[PDB]
Amino acid sequence: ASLLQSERVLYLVQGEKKVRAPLSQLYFCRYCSELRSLECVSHEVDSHYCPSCLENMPSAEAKLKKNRCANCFDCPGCMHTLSTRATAYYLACGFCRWTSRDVGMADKSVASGGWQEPDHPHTQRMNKLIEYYQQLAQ
Amino acid sequence: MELGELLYNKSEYIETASGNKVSRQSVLCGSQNIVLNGKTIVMNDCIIRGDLANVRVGRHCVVKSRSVIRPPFKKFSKGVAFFPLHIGDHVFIEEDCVVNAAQIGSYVHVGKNCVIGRRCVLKDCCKILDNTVLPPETVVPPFTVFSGCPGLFSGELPECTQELMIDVTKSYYQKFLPL
Amino acid sequence: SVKIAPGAVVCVESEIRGDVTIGPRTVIHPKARIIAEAGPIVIGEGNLIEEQALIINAHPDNITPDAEDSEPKPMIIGTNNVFEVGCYSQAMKMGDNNVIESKAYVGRNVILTSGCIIGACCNLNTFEVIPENTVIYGADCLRRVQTERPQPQTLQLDFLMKILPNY
Amino acid sequence: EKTAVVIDLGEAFTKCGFAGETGPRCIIPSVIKKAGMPKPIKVVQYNINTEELYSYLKEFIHILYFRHLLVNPRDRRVVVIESVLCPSHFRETLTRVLFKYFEVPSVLLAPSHLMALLTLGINSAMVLDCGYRESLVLPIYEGIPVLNCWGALPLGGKALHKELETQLLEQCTVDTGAAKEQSLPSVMGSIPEGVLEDIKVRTCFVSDLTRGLKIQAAKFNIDGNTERPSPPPNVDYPLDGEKILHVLGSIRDSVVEILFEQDNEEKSVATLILDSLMQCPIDTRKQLAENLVIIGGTSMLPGFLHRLLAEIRYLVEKPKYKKTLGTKTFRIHTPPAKANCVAWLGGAIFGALQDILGSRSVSKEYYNQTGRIPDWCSL
Numbered sequence: 001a002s003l004l005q006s007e008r009v010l011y012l013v014q015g016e017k018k019v020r021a022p023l024s025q026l027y028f029c030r031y032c033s034e035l036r037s038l039e040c041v042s043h044e045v046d047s048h049y050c051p052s053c054l055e056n057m058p059s060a061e062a063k064l065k066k067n068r069c070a071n072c073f074d075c076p077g078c079m080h081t082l083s084t085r086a087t088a089y090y091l092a093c094g095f096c097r098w099t100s101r102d103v104g105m106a107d108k109s110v111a112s113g114g115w116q117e118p119d120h121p122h123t124q125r126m127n128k129l130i131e132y133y134q135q136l137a138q
Numbered sequence: 139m140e141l142g143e144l145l146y147n148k149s150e151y152i153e154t155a156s157g158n159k160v161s162r163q164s165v166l167c168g169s170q171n172i173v174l175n176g177k178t179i180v181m182n183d184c185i186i187r188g189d190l191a192n193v194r195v196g197r198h199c200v201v202k203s204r205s206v207i208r209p210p211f212k213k214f215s216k217g218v219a220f221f222p223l224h225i226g227d228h229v230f231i232e233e234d235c236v237v238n239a240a241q242i243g244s245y246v247h248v249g250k251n252c253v254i255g256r257r258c259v260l261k262d263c264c265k266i267l268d269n270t271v272l273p274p275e276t277v278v279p280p281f282t283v284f285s286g287c288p289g290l291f292s293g294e295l296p297e298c299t300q301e302l303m304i305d306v307t308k309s310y311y312q313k314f315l316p317l
Numbered sequence: 318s319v320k321i322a323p324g325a326v327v328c329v330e331s332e333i334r335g336d337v338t339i340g341p342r343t344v345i346h347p348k349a350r351i352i353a354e355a356g357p358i359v360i361g362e363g364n365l366i367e368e369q370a371l372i373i374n375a376h377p378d379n380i381t382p383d384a385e386d387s388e389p390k391p392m393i394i395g396t397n398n399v400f401e402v403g404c405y406s407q408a409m410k411m412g413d414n415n416v417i418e419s420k421a422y423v424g425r426n427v428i429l430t431s432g433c434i435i436g437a438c439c440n441l442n443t444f445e446v447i448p449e450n451t452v453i454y455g456a457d458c459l460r461r462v463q464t465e466r467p468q469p470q471t472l473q474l475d476f477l478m479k480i481l482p483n484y
Numbered sequence: 485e486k487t488a489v490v491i492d493l494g495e496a497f498t499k500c501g502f503a504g505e506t507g508p509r510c511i512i513p514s515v516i517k518k519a520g521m522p523k524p525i526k527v528v529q530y531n532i533n534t535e536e537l538y539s540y541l542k543e544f545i546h547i548l549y550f551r552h553l554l555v556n557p558r559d560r561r562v563v564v565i566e567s568v569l570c571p572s573h574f575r576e577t578l579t580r581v582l583f584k585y586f587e588v589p590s591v592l593l594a595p596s597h598l599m600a601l602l603t604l605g606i607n608s609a610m611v612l613d614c615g616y617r618e619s620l621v622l623p624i625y626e627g628i629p630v631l632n633c634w635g636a637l638p639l640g641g642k643a644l645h646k647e648l649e650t651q652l653l654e655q656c657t658v659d660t661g662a663a664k665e666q667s668l669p670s671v672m673g674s675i676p677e678g679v680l681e682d683i684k685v686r687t688c689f690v691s692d693l694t695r696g697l698k699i700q701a702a703k704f705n706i707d708g709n710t711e712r713p714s715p716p717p718n719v720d721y722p723l724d725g726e727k728i729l730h731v732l733g734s735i736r737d738s739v740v741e742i743l744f745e746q747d748n749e750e751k752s753v754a755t756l757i758l759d760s761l762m763q764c765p766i767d768t769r770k771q772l773a774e775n776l777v778i779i780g781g782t783s784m785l786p787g788f789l790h791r792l793l794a795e796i797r798y799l800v801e802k803p804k805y806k807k808t809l810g811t812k813t814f815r816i817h818t819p820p821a822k823a824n825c826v827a828w829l830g831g832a833i834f835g836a837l838q839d840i841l842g843s844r845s846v847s848k849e850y851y852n853q854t855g856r857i858p859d860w861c862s863l
């Protein structure tokens with residue numbers, strides 16, 4: 001794909017939009033007789049998964065959890081998946097040596113269950129405004 | 139170069155046995171624990187240490203020159219020991235590359251001079267770009283490209299990797315002959 | 318010109334040259350490139366070296382000024398010090414409790430303290446003393462961060478005593 | 485019905501997420517990394533060919549709807565926040581991308597200023613929008629934007645980034661790490677926009693009116709011998725690893741002053757409120773003055789809101805504005821979300837209203853039939 005330069009010799013697509021793409025990237029349509037590109041074709045959503053702890057989550061659970069894994073965490077300083085270390089647990093990165101102790105988050109007795117993100121400061125004012133405009137829109 | 143794989147003429151000195159070709163220049167200190175079941179290639183000045191290892195490699199595995207495959211030590215409270223790594227089928231480790239990875243998946247293209255961290259798991263049909271640092275205890279999903287000094291999701295691979303990568307490693311092996 | 322010490326599991330298959338001075342409990346891995354060009358390579362107890370690690374005392378080859386009268390520049394290295402895979406090093410004075418990461422190019426005159434780590438695949442040629450208990454990450458930028466506590470690596474070294482026999 | 489998505493395409497940063505949320509889910513730089521290009525091209529660019537703009541927006545919206553948000557585009561509605569007097573062809577293209585390629589149900593082209601007003605709850609308020617390109621103001625009175633009394637000046641992020649680059653190149657002191665411990669000027673011909681933005685945010689701050697007014701006359705040097713206040717200490721900033729740029733203390737508190745400088749014309753970020761408010765209807769004066777709103781990421785800069793409100797009350801006493809806006813009480817509103825994500829929050833609050841959304845919003849079936857997006861220009 002990359003080692004051999006597939007991005008050199010390209011195939012053309014028929015339709016409204018003409019595109020020059022490698023055969024490796026393109027797809028053949030069997031229903032009819034016309035190969036079409038990744039650009040030309042329409043995209044869908046099937047399943048969500050975490051890149052660290054590979055766990056297939058359903059679409060409903062994602063909407064509640066805001067498209068995030070509860071167990072796994074990413075470091076804020078550098079962008080890498082954190083790891084739980086014990087002494088009774090603290091969160092630490094491998095690349096940079098940023099700890100959860102640095103910012104001043106207390107160690108939890110339970111491994112995963114204890115850790116949480118604080119509630120949004122203007123969440124109560126939010127709901128009051130929605131309900132006002134909801135009644136006014138009605 | 140333009141899809142077609144190019145000629146590479148090997149010297150007389152190389153250990154060719156049961157399909158597996160291993161350069162005599164390349165030391166592999168600990169020949170007992172390391173195992174090469176398939177028709178593997180190991181280029182000159184490369185290292186595969188037996189520091190309490192079980193280095194199983196693929197059918198058509200390729201490791202270019204000046205590149206190291208060492209197992210990582212697991213920091214366990216019960217007992218600190220070196221975790222035995224398992225290189226998958228049709229694995230392509232590029233030149234001058236550092237690998238301290240535990241369980242490297244099948245059909246992977248590890249880039250040039252890219253340092254993979256301690257206890258790092260790689261799932262099948264992935265690609266690490268050149269001059270990239272995967273930190274310790276990181277996972278990369280299938281049909282993915284990880285890059286940068288942080289070592290994070292850059293984008294997705296072509297759909298046809300499973301079928302395509304077979305041609306690459308087998309062609310390189312077939313094209314790589316003695317002078 | 319070799320001062321081999323008992324307890325230290327220096328492997329015979331690793332390459333050594335010049336007026337070396339080996340430490341009490343050092344553990345050198347095979348294909349570890351140590352040279353004593355001008356002055357001697359002084360090694361502290363627990364200073365393990367893993368894989369490719371170019372440790373030279375060739376300031377006469379680097380600059381070649383014909384100055385400082387004798388200019389021995391003896392390479393002092395501290396205790397409990399992890400040299401990782403492919404890390405270039407050339408420091409006249411180096412402190413205890415420091416871990417340079419894999420493919421880390423350390424400068425010609427950079428002095429390391431305690432609890433300090435160099436970034437993986439990061440090069441630092443510029444001469445500058447490292448603060449107490451601070452880590453560097455990334456090649457694109459240095460992005461220095463002070464650590465909470467120094468990290469010891471004793472357990473790792475202690476276990477190699479069992480492995481190295483019959484290898 | 486499904487929770488409608490909110491997008492807000494800006495020159496610097498794009499806000500993205502779902503309706504009825506406390507803030508935006510993803511906020512990222514509005515760029516795309518194309519193969520071959522070393523620096524990523526900016527997705528929103530005014531005055532280019534439609535085909536080239538179409539491809540960039542197609543590429544960008546794809547990244548937002550899959551990598552950042554995880555949801556099918558065809559399933560649920562869109563609430564596109566874009567500032568008033570956004571170029572015609574750009575807005576026409578953005579809609580044409582959403583309707584043709586992605587096949588979205590319906591898009592709603594909300595003006596950023598009217599959305600910012602909803603977040604507070606107040607029906608009437610003056611709204612200043614200090615963005616990247618231009619710092620725009622637009623009085624909103626009881627739901628009706630007053631286009632008659634508009635105001636804009638190029639004193640935003642772009643104008644500030646350019647001013648920082650100019651000052652750094654004059655007093656250029658970098659430690660390359662190659663016998664460059666001594667002050668080395670202009671080793672690099674240009675500084676990348678990504679670095680300049682990071683320096684601006686961390687190092688530079690907005691000075692007090694009293695200190696700022698002295699800084700203006702000091703650098704002018706108007707028949708006076710060293711009449712400048714004592715600057716802050718010089719901060720050393722790393723460039724591309726080894727190269728360490730020593731930022732002068734003067735640059736930090738002088739770079740910002742270009743926004744609040746009079747420059748003879750009497751056209752600052754401060755003046756733009758009073759210039760607009762004086763042009764407003766006589767009945768609306770006292771209501772708009774009392775309800776000020778300061779959105780945009782440029783106003784996030786530390787101590788901007790204090791300097792602005794102070795600079796206002798100083799420019800009030802000036803003889804031009806002294807007659808009309810003399811005895812007026814200027815009070816600033818503190819919005820619930822941060823100054824950057826006020827615009828987005830309005831669209832989310834509006835997106836939560838499923839009943840009104842469907843009616844006001846332009847359906848795909850209408851666009852496919854007509855091919856005419858409604859605007860504040862003539863139909």
Ligand SMILES: Nc1ncnc2c1ncn2[C@@H]1O[C@H](COP(=O)(O)OP(=O)(O)O)[C@@H](O)[C@H]1O
Pocket residue numbers: 493494495496497498614615616617641681685780781782783784785824
């Ligand atoms: N949190 C922040 N703190 C300080 N400055 C900021 C912050 N966020 C953004 N900025 C600056 O202000 C600008 C805000 O632009 P923005 O409003 O996001 O874009 P647009 O006007 O195109 O919608 C950015 O270009 C940046 O330079």
Ligand SMILES: [Zn+2]
Pocket residue numbers: 050051052053054055069070071072
């Ligand atoms: Zn997870």
Ligand SMILES: [Zn+2]
Pocket residue numbers: 075076077078079080093095096097098
């Ligand atoms: Zn980190």
